[PDB]
Design a protein around this nucleic acid. Structure first.
Ligand SMILES: [Zn+2]
Lengths: 199, 49, 210, 149, 79
RNA sequence: GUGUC
DNA sequence: GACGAATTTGCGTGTCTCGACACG
DNA sequence: TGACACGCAAATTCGTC
């Protein structure tokens, strides 16, 4: 009786894996036949064979969903900082406070190369760079540390050390990753999205 | 032709064509559907097709 | 207390109509927009059922804000069921002075011959209908209706020159959808849609009215 | 004697069954109304339920009541609500691109033979999907030209 | 004249340029590099791209009909 | 028609 | 009081209803 | 053996002579 009740459920899944293929393949070949000519032009616009405007910007950002880092996002700023913090260590460079970190960041950001992307990404990175500075002041007044740079305890300056040389490479790397995260002009978005709901 | 008993080839259906379309390659899609399967040279007229 | 609920349903549709005329571009002050229940009770009595507050008493004359020599009416048929001459009397009632634009807030179901005769004459006078059951909630401020703004022609020309396309290329929208009938826009106008989001920001989209 | 019970005394006739759901939190309590019907414009245009915050499941009902631009949002949440209970992962852009394919015309279309006949414009393409004779004979009768692209 | 297109070299154009160069070199074409002893001109076609010595101009067409000329040496190759 | 994925 | 016009609803019919390989 | 989009058609109501 237990073997019969166990093999009853085994036939429940064996008849289910035989029928899924039919209507699944039917819905797949019905979904591909409608979305197979949707392409992205060179002016960041998706159109069909006629020339009609489907969407002014694919998704809203013009980014390939495949090349993304973090649940929908271009890249994670904390992880890239955690990487660049240890790959370029040089104790010769001293530390700095937050009120100078903000001015250095906004001075190095106002350059001739950085004025090519969306200012939304710039505000998104300004929200993260500002939040890192609030973490530094609480740790600095945590134990008691003057930022002038002369205090005989030497290890208290190694808790969260941010130097101006490694902060430029972080910005350049994230800005360059945001350049490659953009979807290429000419990709077939219709055929790509048609099969994403297939499997 | 169909079958190995007559020394035939393989079939390239639509689901495998969708994989080549999603990538975006047009040279290979035309090479293994028109150049290697059936390449014919026909003639027509301009006055009346 | 049923007439109390009827007066509440009537105040709701009156406030929605006022908000619609305010968003369209007509000039109305705030206290008429933001009127409370007791503030409405001092202008119009509640009891009896539909006595002192007749439907003919509900006939609002709004003035166009940018163009002075322009006035619009909006009124309620006294009758539950609409007829043919019952609309023509109200048409020739406000046709007599200088008026061209009026709105009908229909109470219950509509007569097809009436709407056919309506769509018969539109060289000079345009009359548009609205169901009372339909105008009991704000449509733009509901939950997920993106902010729509009807644009001008001096802007659509530079929009066409921006992307180098034609009006046919622009996505078309219907003329009978509740939003278009709300804003009252037929063929030959582009609407801007602001799609909000708190991930990156808000996006801009353009649509054509068909 | 057979239709007196059939005659309703109050309510919405096509509205069938309603249940109240209790949603709790740390110290918070809400009562949400679940209506099993289609007439959204009628269940929202009442005194009790809040008319601004009320959503439906049928795409056609929200299309005819709210509008076409508001129907493209309820179809994105509908698809995403079906994918999160399965343990699958799709990105928002794949759904947003498909939701704009059946809305740029002006009408909410479906991916069938009749919808594809209305959205696209190619003869031999439409013939290579469903019935060939009908499309070919219609093209021969009309006699239009087709630029193969 | 100002360019309104991204400067990064697409893989779609990279592949087609590589294919065109591979097909042309196999046509007894003058090589733009001193190649090592090695067959399969496809293998050496990437060598010219890595050294930016490919005389090919990419013409990008816009939906309206605008033509944009770009050089393979001017494009940025990233990998 | 049978057999496998 | 009686006749032409337009609306809503029960009922008639056509099309498919994933791929691949091998053998008799 | 499910899917509903097309026509085809009869019961019925507002209207005006
Ligand atoms: Zn000839």
């Amino acid at each position: 009786t237990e073997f019969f009740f166990h093999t009853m459920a085994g036939r429940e899944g064996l008849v289910d894996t035989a029928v899924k293929t039919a209507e699944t393949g039917y819905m797949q070949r019905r979904l591909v036949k409608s979305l197979e000519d949707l392409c992205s032009q060179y002016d960041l616009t998706v159109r069909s064979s006629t020339g009609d405007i489907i969407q002014f910007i694919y998704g809203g950002d013009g980014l390939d969903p495949a090349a993304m880092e973090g649940k929908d996002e271009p890249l994670e700023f904390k992880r890239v900082l955690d990487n660049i913090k240890a790959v370029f260590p040089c104790p010769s460079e001293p530390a700095l406070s937050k009120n100078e970190l903000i001015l250095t960041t906004e001075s190095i950001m106002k350059k001739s190369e950085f004025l090519c992307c969306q200012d939304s990404f710039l505000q998104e990175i300004k929200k993260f760079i500002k939040g890192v500075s609030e973490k530094i002041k609480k740790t600095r007044d945590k134990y008691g540390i003057n930022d002038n740079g002369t205090t005989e305890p030497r290890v208290l300056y190694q808790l969260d050390r941010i130097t101006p040389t490694q902060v430029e490479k972080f910005l350049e790397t994230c800005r360059d990753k945001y350049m490659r995260a953009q979807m290429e002009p000419g990709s077939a978005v219709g055929a790509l999205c048609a099969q994403s709901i297939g499997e | 032709t169909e079958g190995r008993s007559r020394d035939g080839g393989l079939r390239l259906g639509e689901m495998e064509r969708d994989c080549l379309i999603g990538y975006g390659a047009s040279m290979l899609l035309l090479e293994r559907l028109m150049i290697s399967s059936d390449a014919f040279e026909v003639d027509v007229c301009g006055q009346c097709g | 207390m049923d007439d109390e609920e009827e007066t509440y349903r009537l105040w709701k549709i009156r406030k929605t109509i006022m908000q619609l005329c305010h968003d369209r571009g007509y000039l109305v002050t705030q206290d008429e927009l933001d009127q409370t229940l007791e503030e409405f009770k001092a202008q119009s009595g509640d009891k009896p059922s539909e006595g002192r507050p007749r439907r003919t008493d509900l006939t609002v004359l709004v003035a166009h804000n940018d163009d002075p020599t322009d006035q619009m009416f909006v009124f309620f048929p006294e009758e539950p069921k609409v007829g043919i001459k019952t609309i023509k009397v109200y048409c020739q009632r406000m046709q007599e002075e200088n008026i061209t634009r009026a709105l009908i807030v229909v109470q219950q179901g509509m007569t097809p011959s009436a709407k056919q005769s309506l769509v018969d004459m539109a060289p000079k006078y345009i009359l548009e209908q609205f169901l009372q059951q339909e105008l009991l909630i704000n449509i733009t401020e509901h939950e997920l209706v993106p902010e729509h703004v009807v644009m001008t022609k001096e802007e659509v020309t530079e929009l066409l020159a921006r992307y180098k396309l034609r009006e046919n290329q622009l996505p078309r929208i219907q003329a009978g959808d509740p939003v278009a009938r709300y804003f009252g826009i037929k063929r030959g106008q582009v609407v801007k849609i602001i799609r909000p989001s708190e991930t990156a920001g808000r996006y801009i989209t353009y649509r054509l009215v068909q | 004697k057979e239709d007196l019970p059939k005659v309703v005394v109050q309510g919405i006739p096509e509205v069938s069954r309603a249940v109240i759901h209790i949603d709790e939190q740390s110290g918070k309590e809400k009562y949400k109304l679940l209506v099993e019907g289609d007439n959204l414009r009628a269940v929202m245009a009442t005194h009790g339920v809040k008319g601004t915050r009320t959503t439906s499941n049928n795409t056609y009902e929200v299309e005819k009541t709210l509008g076409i631009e508001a129907a493209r949002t309820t179809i994105i949440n509908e698809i995403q609500y079906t994918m999160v209970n399965h343990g699958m992962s799709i990105d928002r852009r794949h759904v947003m691109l498909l939701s704009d394919l059946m809305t740029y015309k002006g009408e909410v279309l479906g991916i069938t033979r009749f919808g594809l006949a209305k959205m696209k414009e190619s003869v031999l393409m439409l013939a290579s999907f469903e019935k060939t004779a009908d499309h070919l004979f219609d093209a021969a009768y009309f006699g239009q030209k087709d630029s193969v692209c | 004249q100002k360019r309104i297109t991204t400067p990064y070299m697409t893989k779609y154009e990279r592949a087609r340029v590589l294919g065109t160069r591979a097909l042309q070199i196999a046509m007894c074409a003058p090589v733009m590099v001193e190649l090592e002893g090695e067959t399969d001109p496809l293998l050496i076609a990437m060598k010219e791209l890595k050294a930016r010595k490919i005389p090919i101009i990419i013409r990008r067409y816009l939906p309206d009909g605008s033509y944009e000329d770009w050089g393979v040496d001017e494009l940025i190759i990233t990998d």
